[PDB]
Design a protein around this ligand. Structure first.
Ligand code: MG
Ligand code: MG
Ligand code: MG
Ligand code: MG
Ligand code: MG
Ligand code: MG
Ligand code: MG
Ligand code: MG
Ligand code: MG
Ligand code: MG
Ligand code: MG
Ligand code: MG
Ligand code: MG
Ligand code: MG
Ligand code: MG
Ligand code: MG
Ligand code: ZN
Lengths: 155, 99, 83, 127, 60, 116
RNA sequence: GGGGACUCGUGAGAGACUGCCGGGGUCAACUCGGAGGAAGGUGGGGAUGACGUCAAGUCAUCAUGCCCCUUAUGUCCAGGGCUUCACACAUGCUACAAUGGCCGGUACAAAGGGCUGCGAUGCCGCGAGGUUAAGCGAAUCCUUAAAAGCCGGUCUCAGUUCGGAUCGGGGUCUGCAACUCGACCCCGUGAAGUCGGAGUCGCUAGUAAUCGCAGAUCAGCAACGCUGCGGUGAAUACGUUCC
């Protein structure tokens, strides 16, 4: 806005898994106001995550996010008759947002049948550094680390 | 017994409760058993007209029509009172039923 | 009139014009404006000049058009093609 | 003398009759897990109780009415916190700090003429 | 509207479904309400004028 | 598993497998399987030839299927054309017959856009 | 029966003013942060359009100055048209499915309408409906079962148990009359469509997205429109360089 920053909304702790990271995942899965539907998908995929490791699922979730959080994004800027990308530093609570969007997004177009086994397989493949969500992490990094020459115009 | 049921209706506020209070005060002076003015919910009739006489659909008015109801009193049908129940001139904007 | 409880619908001024010809067995044409009338199996063999909007169109009730309305054989609109 | 409070959230109006006991919900003749089958709603029913730490007491019953089920859960939370004050005048700064006394006025905005919804406009299309 | 059509809608037509309503002030065939007998236009001046009781502008 | 010369799709539940017959949809499929006692939650590969006789003869006594439904359908369209009715002229041109809007639509009776 | 406790209905009032505290500012206007409060700096939304612009729109709401018609450019009636169809644009709806379809079970609304009416109940029909008739000018009776949701079952990624156009047959109701040209129901039929080129739109919170319900006009209805009502309920905003 013209008049400075807006207050951001607090997320209440998730009752089944006592963490605000789970309730920040259910709002990315949420479509059309189906929040009790969106929580059955997230809870159901996290129960399937411990059925393939035995480990606690939110520890697997935080290992899955740490492999897909970007550190450098590649925002665009025009100067004269040419454009380029400036590598800028991702503030941390944007990197939480931008990584939860990649896990939900790249697993909606994944090859399984239901959304529970699509979301759970993307979490397990990201907590090992294998999935397509991990692939966009280094594609975001290789794009931004190919443009260090333009890191001197940071607004 | 307790048989007389009055059913005041009116378009406007403040011309009906004064008709209930200071005019049906003329029943307790004839020694009858009142229960008091009981307010009922208000009816609404909303109308929505186009302002322009031609081709301006997106500009509109909203007219309403409220109707107030009160005084469901169950006074004693004494034959001395039931004459004096209907002697007073109510205002023009007040309706009454004796059911 | 379109529901089986109340029968079919033929205009009464059209029923009198064929009952004066079914009694003496002639086949004169019936100039009419009643497009809304049902064809019933007493119109068989009769011909009808049926108004379409601008003129009267002959129609010959044979046997198989006997559940239809009479206006279905005089087309009102006209379209030969755009080019 | 009986505790008589009321909470209301969007159009739900609950009537809490907080009575001391072993801790039991029978909302409108029906228990918590039989009336609210959702674990997120049940967290915020007794969220004022875990603050004051009196969840094992106070078997309540309420007259749930009006609105939808998520409005009924939030209206019940305001009913409990305003009922805990009438049994306890010392947990008031504990529940005001969490925000369990705010009625949260957030109503459905009306539909405006010329618009498809409360704020949604139709297709613009300058030519 | 045309003055013959205002008198025709007042009388009793053949085939009683053939009847309809017009505005009692200007004789307009469309947008006539049944509670008032008026069109959308003649309702709007008479409500602003205070000439028909109980009707005023609503806000909520 | 040929039923009436129709070649049911193999490994398919019996409520839906009868609907591949031209003349039977979901309402008839519930009332073929109700008169003959064959349950609906049955695959077509587990069908018995003794069961297949029970519903290869219920259909000719009651129903109207391939060929002599398809010819009765195309002899009703044929009937409207030589009597010269409104729908018969409207069948002759590929224009829609049931009082449809022909200004901006009827791309089902007509083909794709000719785009003059 | 009864109770005046709780809600609610609706009258009358109380309450928010930078009023109080701390820092900044010419001590000013005011600003940043608190405390208390249901609410905090315009609490949310509505009603409300200065002087004027566009020779904007309307002579077809009405009114009116000129001008024209008066055996017709007045007026009555029956049929037809306003619903046509090589095409082009625009606003919507339903879709292309598994965060889904279908079947069984079960929960929670709000604002409205009703005497030329609303039709509970019973009864007949697969169904739209038919019939009988109680109660109700209604906080009383009817409309009125909300749908998403929840739980269980099945389908198993297919142009399909996705989609529901088109066409064939059989009906009901309204109305003098349903061919041109009404809606709804049953059975059959099962098209395009597998997420959309250049381009383009709305939205900053109870919003967007999605889910039903009601009203006006109206005999019936092309109602997917319009004006409202509640249900569930997000994601973001560094910022002011660019449009
Ligand atoms: Mg809404
Ligand atoms: Mg426009
Ligand atoms: Mg009419
Ligand atoms: Mg002002
Ligand atoms: Mg001009
Ligand atoms: Mg013009
Ligand atoms: Mg003139
Ligand atoms: Mg005429
Ligand atoms: Mg038109
Ligand atoms: Mg289907
Ligand atoms: Mg169901
Ligand atoms: Mg029955
Ligand atoms: Mg299910
Ligand atoms: Mg294809
Ligand atoms: Mg598919
Ligand atoms: Mg209607
Ligand atoms: Zn008028």
């Amino acid at each position: 806005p013209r008049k400075g920053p807006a207050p951001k909304r607090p997320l209440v702790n998730d009752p089944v898994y006592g963490s605000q990271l789970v309730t920040q995942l259910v709002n990315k899965v949420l479509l059309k106001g189906k929040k009790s539907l969106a929580e059955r998908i997230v809870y159901g995929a996290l129960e399937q995550a411990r059925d393939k490791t035995g480990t606690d699922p939110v520890i697997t979730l935080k290992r899955a996010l740490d492999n897909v959080k970007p550190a450098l994004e590649v925002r665009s800027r025009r100067v004269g008759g040419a454009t380029y990308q400036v590598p800028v530093e991702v503030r941390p609570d944007r990197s939480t947002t931008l990584a939860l969007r990649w896990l939900v997004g790249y697993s909606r177009q994944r090859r399984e049948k239901t959304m529970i086994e699509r979301l759970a397989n993307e979490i397990l493949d990201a907590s090992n550094g294998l999935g397509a969500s991990v692939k966009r992490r280094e594609d975001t990094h290789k794009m931004a680390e190919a443009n260090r020459a333009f890191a001197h115009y940071r607004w | 017994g307790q048989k007389i049921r009055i059913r005041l209706k009116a378009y406007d506020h403040e011309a009906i409760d004064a008709s209930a209070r200071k005019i049906v005060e003329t029943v307790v002076r004839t020694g009858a058993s009142v229960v008091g003015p009981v307010p009922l919910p208000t009816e609404k009739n909303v109308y929505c007209v186009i302002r322009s006489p031609h081709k301006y659909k997106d500009s509109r008015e909203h007219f309403e029509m409220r109707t107030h109801k009160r005084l469901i009193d169950i006074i004693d049908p004494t034959p001395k009172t039931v004459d004096a129940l209907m002697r007073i001139d109510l205002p023009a904007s007040v309706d009454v039923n004796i059911q | 009139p379109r529901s089986l409880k109340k029968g079919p619908f033929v205009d009464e001024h059209l029923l009198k014009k064929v009952d004066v010809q079914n009694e003496k067995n002639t086949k004169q044409v019936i100039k009419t404006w009643s497009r809304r009338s049902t064809i019933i199996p007493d119109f068989i063999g009769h011909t009808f000049a049926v108004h379409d909007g601008r003129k009267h169109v002959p129609v010959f009730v044979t046997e198989s058009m006997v559940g239809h309305k009479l206006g279905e054989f005089a087309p009102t609109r006209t379209f030969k093609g755009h080019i | 003398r009986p505790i008589q409070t009321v909470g209301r959230r969007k159009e739900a109006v609950v009537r809490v009759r907080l009575v001391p006991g072993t801790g039991k919900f029978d909302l409108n003749g029906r228990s918590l897990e039989d009336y609210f089958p959702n674990k997120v709603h049940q967290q915020l029913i007794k969220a004022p109780l875990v603050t004051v730490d009196r969840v094992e007491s106070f078997d309540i019953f309420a007259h749930l009415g009006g609105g939808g089920p998520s409005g009924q859960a939030g209206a019940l939370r305001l009913g409990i916190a305003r009922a805990l004050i009438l049994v306890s005048p010392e947990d008031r700064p504990a529940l005001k700090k969490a925000g369990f006394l705010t009625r949260d006025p957030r109503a459905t905005e009306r539909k405006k003429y010329g618009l498809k919804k409360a704020r949604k406009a139709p297709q613009y299309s300058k030519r | 509207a045309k003055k013959a059509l205002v008198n025709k809608a007042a009388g009793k037509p053949r085939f009683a479904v053939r009847a309809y309503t017009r505005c009692s002030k200007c004789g307009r065939p469309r947008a006539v309400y049944r509670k008032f007998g008026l069109c959308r236009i003649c309702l709007r001046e008479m409500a602003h004028a205070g000439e028909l009781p109980g009707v005023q502008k609503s806000s909520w | 598993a040929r039923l009436v010369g129709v070649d049911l799709p193999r490994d398919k539940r019996m409520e839906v497998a009868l609907t591949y017959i031209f003349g039977i949809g979901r309402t008839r499929s519930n009332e073929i399987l109700a008169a003959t006692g064959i349950d609906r939650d049955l695959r077509t590969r587990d069908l018995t030839e003794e069961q297949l006789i029970h519903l290869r003869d219920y259909i000719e006594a009651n129903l109207k299927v391939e060929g002599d439904l398809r010819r009765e359908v195309q002899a009703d369209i044929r009937r409207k054309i030589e009597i010269g009715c409104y729908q018969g002229l409207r069948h002759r041109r590929g224009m829609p017959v049931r009082g449809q809007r022909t200004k901006t639509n009827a791309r089902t009776r007509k083909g794709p856009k000719r785009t003059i």
